[PDB]
Design a binder for this molecule. Structure first.
Ligand code: A1BC3
Length: 126
């Protein structure tokens, strides 16, 4: 169902969460070789999450589930904020700009934490 597909999507989100927090530790430790690898891993995860989310939204639309569509339209808009900040973080790492990397990192955390109440509301709406 769309609901199982959302639980599948949620798990990918939590995996990216887990990797993100291991990457932060590595960055703080200066282990750039680890950071580079975790940034690759997070890119692949977010790319997969984004695609699963699109499929869920399209299915909610085909189902006529107006409330779930409203919530998913907002949730995906927030996701794209995250993706933009993530991409800026990756560029800061490429550039050696640790000040920008720290900034982007904390912003990506706050953006993600905010969007959590909506993430749970979608689960209940589908
Ligand atoms: C993989 C992933 C998961 C979540 C939520 O857990 C996100 C939230 C905002 C932006 C990007 C995100 N990327």
């Amino acid at each position: 169902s769309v609901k199982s597909e959302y639980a599948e999507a949620a798990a990918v989100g939590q995996e990216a969460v887990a990797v993100f927090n291991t990457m932060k530790a590595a960055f703080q430790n200066g282990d750039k070789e680890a950071v580079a690898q975790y940034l690759a891993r997070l890119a692949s995860l977010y790319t997969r999450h984004e695609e699963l989310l699109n499929r869920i939204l399209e299915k909610a639309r085909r189902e006529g589930n107006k409330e779930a569509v409203t919530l998913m339209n907002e949730f995906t808009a927030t996701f794209q904020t995250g993706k933009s900040i993530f991409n800026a973080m990756v560029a800061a790492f490429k550039n050696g700009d640790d000040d920008s990397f720290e900034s982007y990192l904390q912003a990506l955390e706050k953006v993600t934490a905010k969007g959590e109440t909506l993430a749970d509301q979608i689960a209940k709406a589908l």
